[PDB]
Design a protein around this motif. Structure first.
Motif, PDB file in Angstrom:
ATOM      1  N   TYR H  87      60.834  54.620  40.499  1.00 23.69           N
ATOM      2  CA  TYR H  87      59.853  54.242  39.488  1.00 23.69           C
ATOM      3  C   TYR H  87      58.409  54.291  39.992  1.00 23.69           C
ATOM      4  O   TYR H  87      57.517  54.820  39.325  1.00 23.69           O
ATOM      5  N   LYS H  90      57.499  57.992  40.524  1.00 24.99           N
ATOM      6  CA  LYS H  90      57.924  58.887  39.443  1.00 24.99           C
ATOM      7  C   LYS H  90      57.126  60.185  39.271  1.00 24.99           C
ATOM      8  O   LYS H  90      57.672  61.190  38.820  1.00 24.99           O
ATOM      9  N   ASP H  91      55.841  60.162  39.609  1.00 24.40           N
ATOM     10  CA  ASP H  91      54.992  61.350  39.478  1.00 24.40           C
ATOM     11  C   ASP H  91      55.341  62.456  40.470  1.00 24.40           C
ATOM     12  O   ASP H  91      55.097  63.631  40.206  1.00 24.40           O
ATOM     13  N   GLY H 116      62.838  58.830  34.704  1.00 22.29           N
ATOM     14  CA  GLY H 116      61.722  57.892  34.738  1.00 22.29           C
ATOM     15  C   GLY H 116      61.733  56.756  35.761  1.00 22.29           C
ATOM     16  O   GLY H 116      60.691  56.200  36.098  1.00 22.29           O
TER      17      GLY H 116
END
Ligand SMILES: *C(=O)[C@]1([C@@H](O)[C@@H]2C=CCCC2)NC(=O)[C@H](CCF)[C@]1(C)O
Ligand SMILES: *C(=O)[C@]1([C@@H](O)[C@@H]2C=CCCC2)NC(=O)[C@H](CCF)[C@]1(C)O
Ligand SMILES: *C(=O)[C@]1([C@@H](O)[C@@H]2C=CCCC2)NC(=O)[C@H](CCF)[C@]1(C)O
Ligand SMILES: *C(=O)[C@]1([C@@H](O)[C@@H]2C=CCCC2)NC(=O)[C@H](CCF)[C@]1(C)O
Lengths: 212, 233, 204, 196, 198, 222, 222, 196, 198
Positions: H87, H90-91, H116
């Motif tokens: 989390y 996530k990028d 996600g």
């Protein structure tokens, strides 16, 4: 926008229009385009209203600070370089300003510095900045004489802005005049271009192509 | 900057004479895939507030954790944590609104649309919305996503302005919401038949209903529709 | 880039008691450069008046086209075209160029010679007709014009009164538009006569 | 969209959901994706509603003229007309079509014509976004020569699963039965197929 | 762009046009005459895209000379400008539009008055006391707005133009290599061979 | 990609009277073609007899107002409860706005009050801090529909003395709060007729030496 | 825009709002979105106004000609087939979204056509930005076997849902009832729930207020 | 990729194909997508091989330090560490992970962590490109509390279908059984599962 | 760009630099001196990006004057050019590089010889008999390649420059408003106030 400043026997004439536009929208016909840095220094504003207003007012603060520190009136060369160097620090960030820093000191005499957001700083005798500049230049270049009287110089400046206010869609509203002497600048009024155009047309015989 | 992956659709709500109602289906979509079905998107905080969340589910879970921490923290050195100094619905909202705007201002938002429903200590109804942009607003009825387009028009036929609040009963209000949930199931391609609904009444307190279902649907008239113009059979 | 913002200009038409008025500014510019202060945007074929805002080359072309069409119409019909009919002609002529339109905002004004009824209409660049009972606006200052009209306007004004109204709507709208102004002309139209007045306004 | 065609002992059955979307909005929840191009030659439409309607309308026209001149067309011939249209105009069409018809000599037949315009004759075929979710299920549960009741059940269970996982599928399940006995229209509502 | 100026005085029309022809980094010619005589009393000046410029001018010239022979008559300046405007108005919506701007200066022998027409490549036509194409107007219009008078003599007009050219030579970034000036009046078209220092 | 900005519609109007000033705004808040609320106050009383509105992107507008109110609070703390004069507030707001010169508060802000001479005052700002004291200023969506009207009916622009051949301008006699309220209401009902983002309600805040008062009027809801 | 169609026991009814917009500006407050294809086949249109109008008139013209050629009453399915094939051919470039209804020798019909050429059939339909507010009402109050009066009410309420909740819709409600054995009845402005309140002031100017430079009579007689 | 985890009477079983691709090329046909993060807490990896390996290696490290200080971690705790990593990053991650572990008090547990970084506790979970094809099949054939033999069969049949339709899945089917009895490794070859 | 020329003759180095400062559509100044004296016998000319140009020149000027005071000595022209090259070589890989090109003309009092250095904004330095920045070399190098002689007198150098400027004024599209010329020799730096017609 149309702003100009020129040096002559009696000091400096500063004239500006008072229109503000965003696209084709006339946001205002009564904007100030001259910042009274202090009683002896004037700054003109072209380009970004916020950028010029903010940094020219800040310049005033720097000038005052200089005078308290050195117990002496700041030179136009120094005042203009404070702005120039500040602006240069921001080069590439998107500041938008075309400006004239005008003063009259014992040491320098009548002085005008052109300062823009590209970091350009030029000392000169005549400057016009704005979308209406070319119009004002025509009138100024052909009637300018160093030996102009304070009365005529004031009129020339007012007339040059009128020329631009007429042809340039982004210039107009009214004309604001200033005379800069070694003892400080003197405000010479606000002249609505609407009324000024008709008056000048009649009395002068110019603008023949316009039906009055 | 990001992009939502697992998402929850509409969150609809409204206020009646004694409180507020808020509902949300139990789906967690993954694009066009209706992937998860046991998702609870209504977050109760204490017994006077319910936070309904739509948008990115991973961010919702994050907000959930933030909310639990608020409760834990508020109890610290607080002898009145369950009385005069318990979390008010308005405190919870101001907190979330602050976080939402800070996150969008850092260009790293919590990809959600949130509705905080509850009853203040003085009995006043509380209903306010905040989204990933930090934008906030209040109205007698509030809905996110699809519900904004289809639920608000229906719920507003009940409470069209402030003065209609005192004239609206829990029965009438709950009926509207339940009807709206059915409409959303008809026209929203990312909705679910199963949903949760919560009531927060200044007298009866917080009533949380789970496992509700859209019922009494009209489909029979479908048999009469054949072809797309000239076909007869 | 935007063809309807190159030359500038506005037009406004209004209805009154047994009369109609149509007015326009006289500017023709090249972006920020003012070029002509004598570019009238109002034309007439018989007793029907046509104002056209937008790209100047198209304003000129459209006028020449409608003069051409109304001339043939009169030769065959043996009567001058009416406002209602002309409006349809304008509409279908514009739609005929649906996928390569004339960048204009036409406005029709006139009185039906047989029913004496006042008539005004507006069009989008592809012919969609707007047949308003009160007023019609067009041009680079159309927002300003809507604001002026929605407030200043009221039904059944007499010719002399409608003149003051139409003029104040035009003038004040133009002064808030960088691309409009440099003169203005107003047409007061009645069954029997039509008066044309040039207004005095700022020249900046 | 979720559509399928299944051949069985007595002929063939076509089935489909009834959802048409424009984004996440359900523009129509009672759509009829089962279209008649001839008495006993129907098709299942997926992809563009405008394109598949236009295709079908043209096919129907072609088969009507064909009938007037040479009698009833074979299902293979109908699939060839669809194919011609879909292949020759592949750059401007978005159509996934399943053609199904009943012949007395050939019994039931199914031809699937995917995006490129290629043709594939199969015992049964599934298509539409919802079909991705039932490839495993259908491959495990399909049997040749099933009975009418069994086939109706296979299709009802398959589509209910497609509708369950695919947000682009929904509404009621429609079926069309093609056999020597004639043409039968079937419809199944949510309350029934959702709890299978 | 190049310099294209026009001034209509009491009994004539004067057209001033820059002489430079620049291609990239080099000035290839400094004696270019950006004008074509359409008829004994009608002159047209032009500026714009490299090849379109002359091709268009000569095409118009050919059409007007053909009309002159067929009718044994000289079209009025207004008629010629309308013909030109329509040609450009067709061109703007054609496959490859003519990117040419023009000034038509003519002496109407029937009305006994000079006429100046400014028309851009879109087919935008206007009649003026004085005009220009490109940036030229930006530097010179304030001067013309000031000194212009309808009763000016050809001589006064030349002096006013000289003033404009001087402003252009001072403030404009490009060296357009001076201008060629031509007068159009009741006696035809003539060139002022002496403007290099008038 | 994520867009940090939005548009909540709305229109605001500020008019300075000889000894009073008003700041009005509709109460409709929108997003695209949906109405978020028919009543969401947009003009606030910030204390010290100053009213303010930052129209445009609501999140930015709220943050600004909130920041300015907190600014008044600290002004008191740091300068022995001295009253913040309208001109000082204006300069202060300029700095708040210019501080985000490279990630602007996407709003058009206007404040109204009385200057130190008791005269009515209005200041309108740029999204990045440019400001000017003005007689009247409309902000937001219908601003282009309202300003022309105001130039004509408040500053009597283009209006001359009947019979003077437009040689004598109509005298600038100044309006009362009652006359101003009428222009405000007509401005908004007219704007409501031609702009889809204007409607639902009009809330006006009046500033005089006696404080701040509020008036409310309904606007069409379509 | 909000347009709807609703079938009732012995016919079909269509309704529409009357707002026309150019961006956020209301260009026409009372346009007519109900078009006649033939005496008993009417069309409600959404999308590009010039297109809905032009396409409706083109097919109506051809339908009239077909009627004359076959000596028969026009059928709704014909207008539908002609409209869809025309719209399909233009690949959505003719922005016409229509709800076509009518009664003919074969009964009463209700269809919708989208710009790309796809058609749909149903007992109740709606298109346009107001489409969702309307459909919510229809999905909530529609029932089979509606009376002419109930239908007019349902359709009319569905449009209101749009006027009030959609910024793209507003002003009035137009209706057209097509009953199996009677003439079609067009009810222009069946509802007018948005009448502007009386203005606060009259802006009638005193004569002579405007400055005039020159004046002249215009010749109209040839 | 096709991976799944299924809880049953005695605990839980993890399963997966053994294919790693780089385009249409099979870079590795005997990959082990079943990774141990603790004695009785394993995971199924999908998405980026580099990302999932890095994630797993870090989780194992965290659980090893956790164990040294507070004893054996719960399966829920392991899923929380995976979650945190997925989390918060996530990028820059492309990881679809299923966490499965056996607890004596909780028995078997399955947590799925999709793109996600959200967490979902389920009776069973499927993931990977191949999973799309078996949503219908798995939803129809899954039952809670199945026996070890039944669960091994459910997973073997499900994955064989995923492998059948998905070109990104293939090789052998690997399974890991987690119960009180210990840890068992299972492998099934093509010749066996292809003809199911 | 602007005109920046340099020529090293027998006992001096001459630098010619255009006087125009144009911003967009208008020539704002026609007497601009694009030079800075770094030390009594070292002159630097420059052209490039609007603000960087002077800021860079003055920054170098400040550093060399500081070195002069600290050491009470004048760095050799070679030393100064090396210092400048390194500053530009750092700048090219910095966040925002100085877009400035320069010519350093100096008289080495120890070697008793003039020296000319050309350095672009990338930090590319070369020592030459004559040089230029921008398009200037394109029009003038063929002339210098022809007439240049190592024993030329300052007077011959000025005549050769005059020829270059004339070629520039004939073939270049822009009006650079003449040049300011400066000579650097054993006696320092002086300006040729008379080149407007030498
Ligand atoms: C003139 O420069 C402009 C003025 O609006 C501002 C306003 C206040 C003082 C500084 C100058 N600036 C513009 O951006 C605008 C349009 C330019 F295309 C203006 C009217 O010319
Ligand atoms: C199914 O393929 C879709 C249907 O809307 C159309 C409608 C009628 C018959 C043909 C199929 N097509 C789509 O584009 C839509 C969304 C896909 F993402 C649909 C529901 O799946
Ligand atoms: C409705 O569809 C719209 C109407 O303006 C036109 C006008 C007359 C009848 C046909 C429909 N169309 C639009 O584009 C406009 C805005 C859409 F966002 C409208 C008001 O919704
Ligand atoms: C499955 O997700 C994929 C596997 O290669 C990796 C390898 C080892 C364990 C984690 C999963 N990932 C892919 O990107 C690849 C192609 C997808 F199109 C794969 C085979 O599906």
């Amino acid at each position: 926008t149309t702003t100009l400043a020129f040096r002559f026997q009696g000091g400096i004439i500063v004239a500006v229009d008072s229109r503000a536009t965003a696209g084709n929208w006339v946001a205002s016909q009564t904007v100030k385009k001259v910042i009274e840095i202090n009683p002896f220094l004037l700054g003109t504003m072209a380009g970004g209203a916020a950028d010029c207003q903010f940094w020219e007012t800040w310049l005033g603060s720097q000038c005052r600070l200089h005078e308290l520190r050195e117990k002496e009136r700041i030179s136009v060369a120094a005042a203009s370089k404070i702005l120039s160097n500040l602006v240069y620090q921001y080069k590439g960030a998107g500041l938008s300003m075309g400006t004239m820093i005008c003063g009259y000191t014992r040491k320098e005499g009548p002085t005008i510095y052109y300062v823009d957001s590209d970091g350009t700083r030029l000392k000169g005798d005549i400057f016009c900045v704005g979308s209406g500049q070319t119009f004002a230049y025509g009138v100024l270049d052909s009637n300018y004489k160093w030996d102009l009287s304070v009365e005529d110089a004031l009129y020339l400046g007012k007339r040059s802005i009128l020329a631009a206010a007429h042809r340039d869609a982004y210039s107009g509203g009214s004309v604001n005049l200033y005379h800069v002497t070694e003892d400080g600048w003197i405000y010479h009024g606000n002249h609505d271009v609407g009324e000024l155009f008709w008056k000048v047309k009649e009395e002068e015989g110019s603008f023949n192509n316009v039906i009055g | 900057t990001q992009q939502p992956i697992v998402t929850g659709t509409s969150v609809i709500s409204m206020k009646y004479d004694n409180g507020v109602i808020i509902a949300a289906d139990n789906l967690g979509s993954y694009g066009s895939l209706l992937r998860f079905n046991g998702v609870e998107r209504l977050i109760p905080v204490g017994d006077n507030t319910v936070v309904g969340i739509s948008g990115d589910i991973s961010d919702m879970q994050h907000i959930e954790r933030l909310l639990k921490d608020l409760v834990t923290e508020n109890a610290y050195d607080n002898p009145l944590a369950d009385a005069e100094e318990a979390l008010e619905p308005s405190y919870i909202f101001e907190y979330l609104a602050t976080v939402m705007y800070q996150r969008r201002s850092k260009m790293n938002p919590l990809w959600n649309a949130i509705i905080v429903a509850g009853v203040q200590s003085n009995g006043d109804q509380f209903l306010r919305y905040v989204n990933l942009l930090g934008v906030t607003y209040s109205s007698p009825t509030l809905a996110t996503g699809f519900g904004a387009h289809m639920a608000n028009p229906l719920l507003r036929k009940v409470v069209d302005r402030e003065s209609d609040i005192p004239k609206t009963t829990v029965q009438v209000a709950e009926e509207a919401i339940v009807n709206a949930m059915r409409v959303l199931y008809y026209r929203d391609a990312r909705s679910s038949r199963n949903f949760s609904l919560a009531i927060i009444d200044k007298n009866t307190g917080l009533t949380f209903k789970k496992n509700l279902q859209v019922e009494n649907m009209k489909w029979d008239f479908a048999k009469d529709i054949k072809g797309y113009g000239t076909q007869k059979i | 880039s935007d063809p309807s913002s190159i030359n500038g200009g506005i037009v406004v038409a209004m209805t009154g008691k047994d009369c109609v008025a149509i007015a326009c500014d006289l500017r023709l510019g090249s972006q920020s450069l003012g070029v002509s202060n004598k570019f009238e945007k109002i034309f007439h074929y018989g007793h029907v008046f046509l104002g056209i805002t937008g790209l100047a080359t198209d304003v000129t072309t459209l006028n020449e086209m409608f003069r051409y069409k109304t001339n043939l119409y009169k030769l065959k019909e043996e009567r001058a075209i009416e406002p209602e009919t002309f409006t349809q002609l304008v509409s279908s002529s514009l739609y005929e160029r649906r996928f390569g339109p004339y960048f204009v905002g036409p406005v029709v004004a006139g009185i039906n010679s047989k029913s004496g009824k006042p008539f005004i209409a507006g069009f989008d660049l592809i012919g969609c007709i707007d047949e308003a009972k009160d007023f019609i606006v067009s041009g680079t200052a159309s927002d300003q014009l809507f604001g002026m009209c929605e407030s200043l306007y009221e039904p059944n004004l007499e010719p002399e009164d409608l003149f003051e109204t139409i003029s104040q709507a035009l003038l004040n709208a133009a002064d808030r538009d960088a691309l409009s102004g440099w003169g203005a002309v107003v047409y007061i139209i009645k069954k029997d006569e039509v008066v044309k007045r040039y207004l005095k306004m700022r020249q900046d | 969209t979720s559509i399928m065609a299944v051949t069985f002992k007595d002929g063939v059955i076509l089935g489909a959901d009834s959802r048409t979307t424009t984004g996440a909005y359900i523009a129509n929840r009672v759509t009829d994706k089962l279209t008649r191009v001839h008495d006993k030659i129907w098709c299942c439409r997926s992809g563009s509603a405008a394109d598949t309607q236009a295709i079908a309308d043209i096919v129907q026209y072609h088969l009507e003229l064909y009938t007037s001149q040479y009698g009833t067309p074979s299902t293979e011939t109908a699939a060839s007309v669809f194919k011609e249209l879909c292949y020759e105009n592949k750059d401007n069409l978005t159509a996934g079509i399943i053609v199904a018809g009943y012949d007395d000599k050939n019994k039931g037949e199914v031809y699937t014509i995917p995006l490129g315009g290629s043709v594939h004759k199969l015992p049964y075929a599934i298509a539409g976004s919802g079909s991705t979710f039932i490839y495993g299920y259908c491959d495990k549960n399909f049997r040749e020569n099933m009975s009418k009741e069994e086939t109706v059940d296979f299709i009802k269970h398959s589509l209910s699963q497609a509708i369950k996982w695919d947000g682009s599928s929904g509404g009621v399940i429609r079926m069309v039965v093609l056999t020597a006995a004639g043409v039968e229209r079937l419809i199944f509502y949510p309350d029934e197929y959702e709890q299978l | 762009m190049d310099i294209i100026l026009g001034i209509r005085v009491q009994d004539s029309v004067i057209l001033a046009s820059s002489k430079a022809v620049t291609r990239g980094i080099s000035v290839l010619k400094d004696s270019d005459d950006k004008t074509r005589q359409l008829s004994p009393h009608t002159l047209m000046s032009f500026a714009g895209e490299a090849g379109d410029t002359v091709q268009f001018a000569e095409y118009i010239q050919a059409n007007i000379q053909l009309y002159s022979i067929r009718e044994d008559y000289e079209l009025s300046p207004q008629a010629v400008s309308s013909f030109v405007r329509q040609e450009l108005a067709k061109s703007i919506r054609s496959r490859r539009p003519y990117q040419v701007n023009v000034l038509i200066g003519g002496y109407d022998k029937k009305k006994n008055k000079p006429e100046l027409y400014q028309i851009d490549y879109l087919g935008t036509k206007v009649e003026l006391p004085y005009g220009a194409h490109g940036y030229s107007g930006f530097y010179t219009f304030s001067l013309l707005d000031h000194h212009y008078r309808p009763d000016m003599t050809t001589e006064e007009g030349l002096d006013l133009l000289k003033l404009c050219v001087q402003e252009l030579e001072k403030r404009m970034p490009m060296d357009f290599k001076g201008v060629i000036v031509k007068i159009v009046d009741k006696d035809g078209i003539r060139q002022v061979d002496d403007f290099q220092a008038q | 990609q994520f867009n940090p900005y939005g548009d909540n519609g709305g229109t605001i109007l500020g008019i300075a009277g000889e000894d009073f000033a008003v700041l009005a705004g509709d109460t409709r808040n929108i997003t695209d073609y949906s109405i978020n609320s028919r009543y969401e106050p947009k003009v606030f009383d910030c204390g010290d007899n100053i009213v303010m509105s930052a129209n445009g992107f609501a999140a930015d507008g709220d943050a600004l107002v909130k920041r300015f109110k907190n600014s008044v609070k600290w002004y008191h703390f740091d300068h022995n409860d001295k009253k913040l004069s309208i001109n000082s507030a204006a300069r202060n707001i300029q700095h708040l706005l210019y501080g985000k010169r490279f990630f602007p508060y996407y709003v058009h802000t206007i404040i109204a009050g009385l200057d130190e001479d008791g005269k009515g005052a209005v200041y309108s700002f740029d999204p990045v801090g440019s400001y000017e004291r003005e007689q009247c200023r409309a902000g937001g969506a219908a601003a282009s529909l309202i300003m022309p009207f105001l130039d004509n009916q408040v500053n009597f622009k283009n209006q001359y003395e009947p019979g003077t051949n437009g040689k004598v301008k109509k005298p600038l006699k100044y309006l009362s709060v009652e006359e101003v309220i009428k222009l405000v209401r007509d401005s908004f009902t007219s704007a409501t007729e031609r702009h889809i983002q204007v409607g639902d309600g009009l809330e006006i805040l009046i500033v005089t030496k006696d404080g701040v008062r509020k008036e409310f009027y309904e606007l069409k809801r379509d | 825009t909000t347009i709807v169609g609703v079938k009732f026991n012995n016919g079909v009814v269509i309704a529409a709002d009357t707002r026309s917009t150019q961006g956020p500006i209301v260009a026409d407050k009372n346009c007519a979105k109900l078009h006649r294809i033939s005496p008993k086949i009417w069309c409600a249109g959404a999308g590009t106004a010039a297109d809905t109008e032009a396409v409706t008139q083109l097919i109506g013209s051809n339908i009239e000609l077909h009627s004359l050629y076959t000596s028969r009453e026009p059928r709704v399915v014909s207008a539908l087939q002609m409209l869809k094939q025309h719209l399909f051919k233009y690949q959505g470039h003719i922005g016409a979204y229509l709800i076509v209804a009518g009664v003919d020798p074969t009964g009463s019909h209700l269809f919708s056509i989208h710009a790309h050429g796809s058609t749909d059939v149903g007992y109740y339909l709606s298109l346009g930005s107001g489409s969702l507010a309307a459909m919510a009402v229809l999905e909530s109050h529609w029932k089979q076997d509606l009376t002419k009066e109930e239908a007019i009410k349902l359709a009319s309420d569905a449009i209101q849902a749009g006027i009030w909740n959609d910024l793209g819709s507003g002003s009035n409600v137009d209706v057209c009832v097509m009953e199996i054995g009677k003439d079609a009845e067009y009810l222009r402005n069946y509802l007018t729930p948005n009448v502007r309140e009386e203005k606060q002031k009259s802006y009638k100017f005193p004569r002579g207020t405007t400055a005039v430079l020159k004046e002249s009579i215009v010749n109209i007689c040839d």
